[PDB]
Amino acid sequence: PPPVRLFGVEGTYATALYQAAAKNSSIDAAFQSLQKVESTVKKNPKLGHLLLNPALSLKDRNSVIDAIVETHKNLDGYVVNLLKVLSENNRLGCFEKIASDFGVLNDAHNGLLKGTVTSAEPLDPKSFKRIEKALSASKLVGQGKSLKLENVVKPEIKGGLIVELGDKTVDLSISTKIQKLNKVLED
């Protein structure tokens, strides 16, 4: 059973990878090695970008796979079986997609809460820290998952702040308040 199913298309692949590596026991190893080969795929720019797009054979695809396992002899065998799956399904256009998804499952398994505090401008580090403290203090943190605080800059969200994490947000942006004030003052 995965740590909560997420993603259907491509994520059945990710789920499978997760549960299979749960039966491998080593999920972290798998993820780390996948991360490393994925990174060198991205840092292979000629045909590691320009042949991420299927247009070539099953057999040619297989030989690309063979080149990939020459690039790293550490990739476990489950993620080498994942290479087999992707070659067989001839879908390379969702390799990094699967990588991202496996990251989500993996860090859910690790248990790290995710969040973002989108604002109009990058906030103070004191603000960051106070918010980090607050979020950990709040019942939202289960003490089992540790927030990510990602500042996003969104001037379109004119002033204020919006805190986001879980399915729970508090939006005390200036834009929303102005919007509501204006709207009701058009009534």
Partner: protein, 91 residues
């Protein structure tokens, strides 16, 4: 590295800018890979020896419409752009 070289080796070469290679084909429309710069409603000439007018320009694929019998075209043939919107001699 040597791996990248071997990948380069099995690659058909060319980024298929202004030429394509045909994919699945039948019912008088073909779906071609490449033709990166392609004018809309252009005339393309297949290596088959038939010409077609690009109709559906879709993300990552272009769907030519075959002006001619389907027997002529076969999968994986190289389509070169006439480079002109469909024109006919006038005078």
């Amino acid at each position: 590295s040597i791996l990248e070289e071997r990948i380069k080796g099995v690659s058909d070469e060319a980024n298929l800018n202004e030429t394509g290679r045909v994919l699945a084909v039948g019912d008088g429309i073909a779906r071609v890979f490449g033709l990166n710069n392609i004018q809309a409603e252009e005339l393309v000439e297949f290596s088959s020896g038939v010409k077609g007018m690009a109709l559906n320009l879709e993300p990552g694929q272009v769907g030519i419409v075959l002006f001619g019998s389907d027997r002529l075209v076969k999968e994986g043939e190289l389509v070169k752009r006439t480079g002109n919107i469909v024109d006919v001699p006038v005078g």
